[PDB]
């Protein structure tokens, strides 16, 4: 059915991104995280008041990982065969139509998914 | 810390801070503890201290693992061949130093105590005989243990 399977509460240890050092000061440095290799760098040495560093300690719960706030795991679907592939996982997986799928094929995918009970993440894109 | 105290702490199984253990009083052990004087506080525990330490913070070394002592079956499967089949037997062996005290103490994982409720004395790094917390407090180690638990 529409409602997802019962699950433990979704806890996110950290909600904001890991910003690369000096990306605020330079426009040539994109915000994507990079490991600082400087031997004197304060962000590498972990001085207080500085940017945090990604670590496995921030890892999300194994039984909660990869699922949306609704509780489904996203599955990228390109066609009616993909939604029929999701047929058996109504309460665990949700369908997400790929960006390159045309309007009529999206309509068909939503129709088959609504027959199957499979939740659609982007059901109202081209309506 | 010098290497001789570093080795004595390793052998007394005091790897962390607030890391109490039981020791059988003897010439060799007393000399070890007297050398490691500047880092530990030791004394003579009583029945209540032993009972509460075993009951609340008692864990066993089972195949090299820390198992909470929730079961007389665990006690029997580990120390049964020495006649210790229950936590009462373990407490008795610890308190009245029996023939198998070495086996009982080693089975007991070193007790990981919390910081005292009430703190230590104003300057904890002198001797108990000089207004501090280090060294041999004969029967006041009981009060320290109530603070630690």
């Amino acid at each position: 059915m529409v409602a997802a399977k019962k699950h433990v509460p979704i806890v996110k240890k950290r909600t904001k991104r890991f910003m690369r050092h000096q990306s605020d000061r330079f426009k040539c440095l994109d915000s994507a995280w990079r490991k600082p290799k400087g031997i004197d760098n304060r962000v590498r040495r972990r001085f207080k008041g500085n940017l945090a560093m990604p670590s496995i300690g921030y890892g999300s719960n194994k039984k909660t990982k990869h699922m949306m706030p609704s509780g489904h795991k996203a599955f990228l679907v390109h066609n009616v065969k993909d939604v029929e592939l999701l047929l058996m996982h109504n309460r665990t997986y949700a369908a997400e139509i790929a960006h390159n799928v045309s309007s009529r094929k999206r309509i068909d995918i939503i129709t088959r998914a609504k027959q199957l009970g499979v939740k659609v993440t982007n059901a109202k894109a081209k309506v | 810390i010098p290497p001789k105290p570093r080795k004595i702490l390793q052998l007394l199984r005091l790897r962390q801070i607030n890391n109490g253990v039981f020791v059988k009083v003897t010439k060799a052990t007393a000399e070890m503890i007297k050398i490691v004087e500047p880092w530990v506080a030791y004394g003579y525990p009583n029945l209540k201290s032993v009972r509460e330490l075993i009951y609340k913070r008692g864990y066993g070394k089972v195949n090299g693992q820390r198992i909470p002592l929730t079961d007389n079956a665990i006690i029997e499967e580990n120390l049964g061949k020495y006649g210790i089949i229950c936590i009462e037997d373990l407490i008795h062996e610890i308190f009245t130093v029996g023939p198998n005290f070495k086996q009982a103490a080693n089975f007991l994982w070193p007790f990981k105590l919390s910081n005292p409720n009430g703190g230590f004395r104003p300057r904890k790094f002198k001797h108990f005989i000089e207004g501090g917390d280090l060294g041999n407090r004969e029967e006041h180690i009981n009060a320290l243990i109530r603070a630690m638990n």
């Binding site: 795991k73 058996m88 199957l116 | -």
Partner: protein
């Protein structure tokens, strides 16, 4: 001999034409896969005894592998279409999987697949009207 279900799983666990792999899970497009999940339990084309349930025009078409016909694909699948009652399809499908020892571990999955296909064949409810909120609603 040289070939078995174990050998086939050894060859095909890492890559199939039926294998679809994404970040949230690995699935299988095989018609003899009752849960569309990549596993030796559910690899129908791998296992000697296997079951598969597909939709019909009104009901469910159930296929099962014939162990004495693995060399003959055109005559390797016992196909029965169950177009009577939901409860009767479940009875027959659970017997085909558990009475004579052909995949009792897949009995539950087969019954669930039949139920899901029948619910899919059931007529579908109209949508609730969409309600706008905040700036969009006042816009």
């Amino acid at each position: 001999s040289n070939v078995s279900a174990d050998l086939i799983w050894e060859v095909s666990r890492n890559y199939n034409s039926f294998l679809v792999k994404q970040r949230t899970g690995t699935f299988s497009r095989d018609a003899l896969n009752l849960t569309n999940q990549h596993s030796r339990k559910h690899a129908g084309f791998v296992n000697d005894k296997a079951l598969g349930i597909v939709p019909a025009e009104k009901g469910v078409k159930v296929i099962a592998k014939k162990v004495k016909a693995a060399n003959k694909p055109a005559s390797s699948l016992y196909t029965v279409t169950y177009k009577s009652t939901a409860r009767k399809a479940y009875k027959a499908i659970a017997s085909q999987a558990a009475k004579h020892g052909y995949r009792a571990d897949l009995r539950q999955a087969a019954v669930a697949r039949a139920s899901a296909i029948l619910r899919s064949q059931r007529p579908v409810k109209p949508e609730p009207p969409k309600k706008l909120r905040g700036a969009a609603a006042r816009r």
